[PDB]
Amino acid sequence: VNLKQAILQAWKERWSDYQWAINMKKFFPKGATWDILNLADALLEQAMIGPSPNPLILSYLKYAISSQMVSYSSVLTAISKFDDFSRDLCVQALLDIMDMFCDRLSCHGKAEECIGLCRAL
Amino acid sequence: QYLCQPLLDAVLANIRSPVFNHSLYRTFVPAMTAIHGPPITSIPSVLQGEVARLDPKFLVNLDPSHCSNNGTVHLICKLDDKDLPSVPPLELSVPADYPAQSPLWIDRQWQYDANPFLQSVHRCMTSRLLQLPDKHSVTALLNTWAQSVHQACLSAA
């Protein structure tokens, strides 16, 4: 259920967004709510490799954002950690992704998760 | 009727009198006493039950926000099906006196937008909820949600 190992197999054959989501669950029996795994962070690492970020990783990130069970804080921290301003394509893609899910910032869960969201913000 | 008209006439001509009971007792106690002798020596239960009796695909629970312990309750739903992808929570509101009426679904249009798959789910959802009859329950709506997700997934692939 390793992140790189599963992402490579997903990438080799063109898969729809829902099929990859269905498949990921099948790959690892204990999901652990995507916390130890840092799935949002892992996608970014694949995305920044190419000079132009591939649209399929961005679509996977969009789908992960769509589900309420993926916290917005982890995505924000992963985006902030990268920086390094190599080229305009990556910053434009990150700008579009950030523009997509902002202005709501709704968090459901325990209070310490809200505290972590404040620090991530 | 037959053989007992005099008793009916006597009773009707005697009724609503302040001393009717005294008259009846004084006229009918002694023979009866002599012949026979002495006389004889929050959350309503319906919602809890229906939640207890749902398929383990669902783990519905109370909404952390909104009011509670009233006739109207709010529930948030999550779907855990190995064969289906993840979808918006599809929260519900249950009014007071849930039997003999129907619950309503709070639409969230922006949540289901920006994806062809999710808006296909949404239009199938609107179609199915227009196809649902009156006086329906919440388990029927949850099963409709599951079946609409399955149909949308089948149509996509």
Swiss-Prot record, chain A:
Cellular compartment(s): Nucleus
Expressing tissues: Ubiquitous. Abundant in skeletal muscle, heart and placenta.
Disulfide bridge positions per record: none
Quaternary assembly: Component of the Mediator complex, which is composed of MED1, MED4, MED6, MED7, MED8, MED9, MED10, MED11, MED12, MED13, MED13L, MED14, MED15, MED16, MED17, MED18, MED19, MED20, MED21, MED22, MED23, MED24, MED25, MED26, MED27, MED29, MED30, MED31, CCNC, CDK8 and CDC2L6/CDK11. The MED12, MED13, CCNC and CDK8 subunits form a distinct module termed the CDK8 module. Mediator containing the CDK8 module is less active than Mediator lacking this module in supporting transcriptional activation.
Function: Component of the Mediator complex, a coactivator involved in the regulated transcription of nearly all RNA polymerase II-dependent genes. Mediator functions as a bridge to convey information from gene-specific regulatory proteins to the basal RNA polymerase II transcription machinery. Mediator is recruited to promoters by direct interactions with regulatory proteins and serves as a scaffold for the assembly of a functional preinitiation complex with RNA polymerase II and the general transcription factors.
Family (UniProt): Belongs to the Mediator complex subunit 24 family.
Name of the protein in its database record: Mediator of RNA polymerase II transcription subunit 24
Full-length numbering of the shown residues: 4 to 124 of 989
Swiss-Prot record, chain B:
Compartmental location: Cytoplasm; Nucleus
Modification after translation (UniProt): Ubiquitinated by TRIM11, leading to proteasomal degradation.
Induction description: By 12-O-tetradecanoylphorbol-13-acetate (TPA).
Summary of the tissues where the protein is detected: Expressed in all tissues examined, including heart, brain, lung, spleen, thymus, pancreas, blood leukocyte and placenta. However, the level of expression varied, with highest expression in the placenta and peripheral blood and lowest in the pancreas and kidney.
Residue ranges of the TM segments: none
Function: Component of the Mediator complex, a coactivator involved in the regulated transcription of nearly all RNA polymerase II-dependent genes. Mediator functions as a bridge to convey information from gene-specific regulatory proteins to the basal RNA polymerase II transcription machinery. Mediator is recruited to promoters by direct interactions with regulatory proteins and serves as a scaffold for the assembly of a functional preinitiation complex with RNA polymerase II and the general transcription factors. Required for cholesterol-dependent gene regulation.
Record family assignment: Belongs to the Mediator complex subunit 15 family.
Oligomer status and interactors: Component of the Mediator complex, which is composed of MED1, MED4, MED6, MED7, MED8, MED9, MED10, MED11, MED12, MED13, MED13L, MED14, MED15, MED16, MED17, MED18, MED19, MED20, MED21, MED22, MED23, MED24, MED25, MED26, MED27, MED29, MED30, MED31, CCNC, CDK8 and CDC2L6/CDK11. The MED12, MED13, CCNC and CDK8 subunits form a distinct module termed the CDK8 module. Mediator containing the CDK8 module is less active than Mediator lacking this module in supporting transcriptional activation.
Protein name listed in UniProt: Mediator of RNA polymerase II transcription subunit 15
